[PDB]
Design a protein around this ligand. Structure first.
Ligand code: HEM
Ligand code: HEM
Ligand code: HEM
Lengths: 727, 727, 309, 83
């Protein structure tokens, strides 16, 4: 054979390339010299293909992989065709159960490194030296939808990091919001059943907008705090690169002296916080259900590595009861104004997997996977999670040897007396499979706890109380965190929250459920309750109007760190700009546009009404990446329309809609020269409007203005104006 | 802690040692210098233990592996004990389904080499060069019983050989008898259900001696041939080393020119053919249910490598129809008087596994695993087998990636477009997972058939007929082969066959089934039928006495190759002798006895009425291996009683019974000096008798005479004398 | 073709008969009049056979269950033979993992009833009324050996009783000796690995008589008490009917007023205590490895119902 | 077998036939049906060979494949007529 093109254009360059420049490829082929200990240790299972013969799994070369064996060329297929049956058998058995929750996820390899030794507060080996590099495997996910569902749904996001330390695997299994919906793990199946597709008909997918979810929420006020985050734009991240990560639970750090320090884990996105807007998010589930998976993969291939700062909120043991909420209640956050996040290290995701199924689908994370230097707490949600992941992985990954699946393997030594189990890979030579033993001189042997390389010993927390199935009274406060969150949002973030509740409750068929949810909102904030109620045709009662708001959180009436946008944190590197071309584009504009974008690490996509190419005014040939319909504004952060022959596209409905959609979704728009003709479709005054870049040509000042808008993410002042645009 | 004894007696020497001399151990520790390509390729998964810390599967060191985490030392166990939960979870999931048939099996590693190139008749790479060594993994088995059933049952034995060739895995999955019970694979479940434990109560284990088996046999005369073999001493082999091996089905060899030659595969035991006697075998299932497994392991540890000669019965395509029987009928053997076995190569089993579960229990053999140069035939039993193994292995070994389990992995290259499936180990980097493809230039690619390293192409056999569920009329003959077998046995072998049928039929509760089987036997041979009938208190009718015997098989009235013992082929190396000691043994006898045995590679076990040591007449300290009851005569091939203080053991019931049992089971017995006092125990005349070695001491010809008897295996002439004897 | 004898001697009489008098049979056919609430509740899944056509699992009648479909009577088997493939597929997937421990066991149905109300010490409904019967299902077992190992080995015996009570299933999962070898569950895998067949060669089956068991015992003196019981004749019962049963652990009884009482459960064999002697037991593993299973089944068919207090 | 966990997926309620189904197949993971047949094989005399085979016929008969004519060599070849 020789089916590849003679020019070699089927194979992507093995160098960092911007989104759309090359076909995407398996990590080890795209970036073969991006290495870490874990990636190198997977080399024993990586399989090539070039220049090898096609064989059965038994190593028998196949001569004809196009036909079954039959009696005559139009005859019946024969049972002795072992090549066909092995091939079909393997195909028939490719699927495994998806994760019970967080089935939809996108993962990548990277590395973590501390900023300084944390030996004063923890003996965790991976935090002991700034020069200790820990390989990591991170999986980002939604929660409700199946593995085949869409990425930009409204949902909580999972953020799971597997740290391959020298003293064991440590999995930090968190989310993108700092609290969970429920307090005790016993109600997990109830909550998850309520949010998941309803049981009779299995609708709806990737949505909490249905009766059962809001039924549960209305009957369980502990849920309201996370519900507030989900209803805000936090529920629709722009990308996994632009969301925060939280471990949620209070855990413990244990140092060499044995002192325990309470800790809550945080991931700060170094690309900053950024979320979509609901219409854009929902439309994006239809135009590209793989948007976040794609964005992560392409950012890594481009060298726009997702970077996160690990941060710790540290609370002395003696300060356990100094807050007006319980530190062990997972529905309560620890305001950063009260307890600041200490910056501890940075994680860089710099390499995509080779095989999604092998490495992403089969990865198994567990919050119970801790190492010496870390310990749990009595958080009743965390307590129940400890049992659950162990249990689900024995059926999901087919047996108790899932730690032998390459991606899950520790990079440090593991030796014990455990044996057998389905698909046992390790062949143990130990004469003994029990301890104590004399026949192998008791090896492998226990190791006392110690400052480094010591065995695991639980912090000796004092336990006193009766065996009870009882919620702590300290957890029975449900409205002050939701109120604190609400008051910390900007006015437009508040408006998006109102709209989130309003949209979701509008899809709840039983009107009494919406009414019960509005009543709960009245216990949080009257303005919030009224705005939602007005959108639902609901009138608050006299009593609802008089519900006294919950108390502030330890004197706080707001905390700007809870807002996505209150404190500027924008980053344009890795963002993408749509450039709407015409058949005789002003080549001087493109040059200035592209040069300015490239200086800020901002990508561009050249769009037209057909594929192929257009020729600029000076003969510069411009290759078209996609059509106006083919790559909608939903996939970009800003839109630039350069000068040239605008009559080519001024009557293009798709071109006009591109701008109306971007406008509606608060995206920066830049119009050069005769591209100002488009001002009429989005009804922009002659004298202009903040958020619309316009000039005689696209020189350097024009580009600076557009890049300034992009750093602020969206044009929030345009909100009141989008009402009157039919898009 | 440091529990091993300071003299290092807990660890067996890494050198060949006779059975019982040292504790047995994992193959790689016992014989680290014994290597082969496959054994070397398993190094990546072998796990050590010495000097390593005890950890969880995630690599976390464990400090206290003696206790669960609890609230208070007398308190309740806590759910956060992740160490306890991983350890119990792995334990809980240790078992996998046992094989549906042949669950009880023992295996070992070895190597094969052909005597000469067979390129003229087959292009199979492993048979192309005398200097080409092919690693093998062989598993011997019983058929009916579970994995925890006994070894020395009366049953067919499985003999499966996995050849790790350069062009693919070839599995030769045979039995120890040259025919099978049924003709068509569609009846496999019927036959197997009939022989296995009956469904209401799951009795009996490891036995065909029950109603349903004999019910099925009585209604399906095709089974009679293999039933004759099972009722003979063939069904109770001395060892896996002393039984023949057969592929049963007629397969094809394909040469480079495309010529097909019919072939039946044979394994000749280089240690000769040898079987137990029923009473011994049955009692041995009680005294040592792991006798064959143990014997194999210890032979290999001693350096008594099981060796087998691969041989081929070759039949030209033109002679397909030249016999009285159909070549494709698996209930018919090909008499070696008609078609000789041509010697092909030698297989040596020289290393035990490291871990029984990992290597033995998970090994997967398939008769459909053939390589270029071999092909199938239309044998209807073979045809159905091709489907079955593939299918059963998906549930037994948890998915479609069982070829990735270390023992099953090819040592040659394997590449294809198959992906995923439970427990997927290989991480594919191929951009393509389909063919034809241009994105990876169509690799891996198909390979045309050719003389060497070519793709597999089925022999173009002509097929002509209608789609029918019909047994070929050529297969409808059921008694001539059984008769040929019967007539080829010695008189004592015939008696053992009669005794096997009689015993088994006595366990059939419904008398009419016994009568029906007797009627079938009367179609085979009147002498056989009459002898069995007499033992069952059944009288043959006049019509039964007049059933004309079936015709000879192609003019043959007997074939001595079908007998275990007609043609002497005795080999004493690896056999064992019990030495019954006394408290003042004649040291001179011991010296002569032990050195003579050692010179011929015959092992010995020094037995006494207690453990510890005995002191010979000259001060020699003699370590006792076992007591008379601890290691019964069932486990040895011969018994020697040296001179000394015989009154020490003369009135010892066990010592006397030891000889009665060994005498009853036709084993050579040698008595020196005053040990001749034991002659009255077994009723030996003053003059002596053939099969009893006796003299004033064990000096001159005493050992040579004993070894001559051992070479003949058992003293068949003693059969009439054991008739009485209460033992 | 292949039909029953004319005399009808192929079928066991459906009345109590002594061991060996009739071929043994499924319980519902041997004793159709013996019922209890649980036995009756299993009627939804019991399947008969007499007078019904042989079919695939999809209900398609089979015409020829003796042959595979082939092209010509001496030809290759065809892939379209769906009858053969369903039949072989089901056969190929018959086995399920045996129990990790107590894989060898024999079971029977029965009933329990208290002698008097125990309401003063426990609110458990199955012990509240002497005339309130609770169906049981009991499994007796060995511990070490696989499902196909022998019955009369030297080992501890398991005695598990499932009580189908009106307020839920209550399982009393005990043994035939009143203590266990170890103290903490965390060491269960260590102990069980030590007593099971050794990992390199998987020997020996159904026996503690090997180095790793005694090695562990020698290093863990807490095991000595149950070792004493195992080495005594308790380790080789004559029948499941002639051994004691014990829950081993202290559990609690809770009455309606909330009072807790510590309790240890016992089963007293009404057939008395009886064991084999070692030589006999060991030889019996060879002559009849299914001795206990057979003996239990035949006692029940004979009307010698195993009774325990 | 893998999607539905074993060979007894026909006992899953939605998959169950509404007509009679009787055969000698036994066991398998999650076996619901409790067979009372003394025999789990055929031919058998202990249950008078029930359940029994049924000859093909106009109605309620056993399945018999149409006796289509098969002629040709064992090949892995696409028919030219499909090209
Ligand atoms: C603070 C609250 C929780 C957080 C932050 C959290 C986070 C996560 C994440 C990120 C994943 C997906 C990991 C991956 O990418 O594979 C996950 C999966 C899962 N979660 Fe949790 N979860 C929480 C609560 C719970 C609770 C209370 C339970 C049950 C008691 C639970 C049970 C599971 C299970 C069974 C899975 C599937 C794991 C697998 O199949 O490998 N989660 N969770
Ligand atoms: C000539 C007749 C046959 C011979 C010589 C034979 C030989 C064997 C042997 C030696 C084994 C065990 C291999 C091992 O040690 O793992 C085995 C297993 C097995 N046999 Fe065959 N067999 C025969 C007929 C059949 C038939 C007709 C079928 C079904 C159509 C069948 C289905 C099986 C299955 C399902 C297993 C279990 C394999 C596994 O679990 O890996 N056998 N057979
Ligand atoms: C007082 C101590 C114990 C007693 C009396 C006991 C009793 C039993 C019995 C009678 C059975 C068999 C039930 C049946 O017939 O199916 C059994 C099975 C089992 N035992 Fe326990 N056992 C004890 C300790 C333990 C411990 C400490 C563990 C683990 C921590 C354990 C784990 C198991 C398991 C996993 C099974 C298999 C159950 C199944 O597959 O259904 N046993 N035990």
């Amino acid at each position: 054979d020789s089916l590849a093109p003679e020019d070699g254009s089927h194979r992507p360059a093995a160098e960092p390339t911007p989104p759309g420049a090359q076909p995407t490829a398996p990590g080890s082929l795209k970036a073969p010299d991006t290495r870490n200990e874990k990636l190198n240790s997977l080399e024993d299972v990586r399989k090539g293909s070039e220049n090898y013969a096609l064989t059965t799994n038994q190593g028998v070369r196949i001569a004809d992989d196009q036909n079954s064996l039959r009696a005559g060329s139009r005859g019946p297929t024969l049972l002795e065709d072992f090549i066909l049956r092995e091939k079909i058998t393997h195909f028939d058995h490719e699927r495994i159960p998806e994760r019970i929750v967080n089935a939809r996820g996108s993962a990548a390899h990277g590395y973590f490194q501390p900023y300084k030794s944390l030996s004063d507060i923890t003996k965790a080996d991976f935090l002991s030296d700034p020069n200790k590099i820990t390989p990591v495997f991170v999986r980002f996910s939604t929660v409700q939808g199946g593995a085949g569902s869409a990425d930009t749904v409204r949902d909580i996001r999972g953020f799971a990091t597997k740290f391959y330390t020298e003293e064991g695997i440590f999995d930090l299994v968190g989310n993108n919001t700092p609290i969970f919906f429920i307090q005790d793990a016993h109600k997990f199946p109830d909550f998850v059943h309520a949010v998941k597709p309803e049981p009779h008909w299995a609708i709806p997918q990737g949505q909490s907008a249905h009766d059962t979810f809001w039924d549960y929420v209305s009957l369980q006020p502990e849920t309201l705090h996370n519900v507030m985050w989900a209803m805000s734009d936090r529920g629709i991240p722009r990308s996994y690169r632009t969301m925060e990560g939280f471990g949620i639970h209070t855990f413990r750090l244990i140092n060499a002296e044995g002192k325990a320090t309470f800790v809550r884990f945080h991931w700060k996105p170094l690309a900053g916080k950024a979320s979509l807007v609901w219409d854009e998010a929902q439309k994006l589930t239809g135009r590209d259900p793989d948007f976040h998976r794609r964005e992560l993969w392409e950012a890594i291939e481009a060298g726009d590595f997702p970077e996160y700062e690990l941060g710790f909120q540290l609370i002395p043991e003696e300060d356990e009861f100094k807050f007006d909420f319980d530190l062990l209640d997972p529905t309560k956050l620890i305001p950063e104004e009260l307890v600041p996040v200490q910056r501890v290290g940075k994680m860089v995701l710099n390499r995509n997997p080779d095989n999604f199924f092998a490495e992403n689908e089969q990865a198994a994370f567990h919050p119970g996977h801790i190492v010496p230097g870390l310990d749990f707490t009595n958080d009743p949600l965390l307590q129940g999670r400890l049992f659950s992941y162990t249990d689900t992985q024995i059926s999901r990954l087919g047996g108790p040897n899932f730690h032998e699946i390459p991606i899950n393997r520790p990079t440090c030594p593991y030796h014990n007396f455990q044996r057998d189990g389905m698909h046992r890979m390790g062949i143990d030579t130990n004469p003994a499979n029990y301890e104590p033993n004399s026949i192998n001189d008791n090896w492998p042997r226990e190791t006392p706890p110690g400052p480094k390389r010591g065995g695991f010993e639980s912090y000796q927390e004092r336990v006193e109380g009766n065996k009870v199935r009882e919620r702590s009274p300290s957890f029975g406060e449900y409205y002050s965190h939701p109120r604190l969150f609400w008051l910390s949002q900007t006015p437009f973030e508040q408006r998006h929250i109102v709209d989130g509740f309003s949209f979701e409750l509008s899809k709840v068929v039983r009107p009494y459920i919406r009414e019960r949810v509005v009543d709960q909102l009245a216990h949080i904030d009257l303005t919030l309750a009224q705005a939602v109620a007005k959108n639902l045709g609901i009138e608050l009662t006299d009593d609802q109007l008089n519900i006294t708001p919950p108390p502030d959180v330890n004197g706080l009436k707001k905390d700007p760190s809870l807002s996505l946008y209150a404190i500027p944190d924008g980053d344009v590197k890795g963002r993408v700009v749509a450039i709407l071309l015409n058949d005789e584009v002003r080549s001087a504009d493109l040059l200035a546009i592209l040069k300015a974008l490239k200086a800020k690490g901002v990508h561009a996509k050249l769009l037209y009404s057909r594929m192929g190419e257009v020729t600029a005014d000076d003969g510069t040939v411009l290759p078209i990446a996609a059509t106006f319909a083919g790559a909608p504004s939903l996939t970009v952060d800003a839109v630039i329309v350069p000068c040239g022959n605008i009559a080519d596209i001024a009557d293009n409905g798709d071109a006009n809609y591109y701008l109306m959609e971007a406008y509606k979704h608060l995206k920066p728009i830049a119009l050069a020269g005769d591209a100002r003709k488009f001002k009429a479709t989005i009804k922009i005054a002659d004298q202009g409007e903040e958020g619309i870049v316009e000039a005689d040509s696209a020189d350097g000042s024009f580009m600076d203005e557009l890049l300034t808008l992009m750093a602020a993410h969206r044009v929030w002042s345009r909100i009141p104006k989008i009402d009157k645009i039919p898009a």
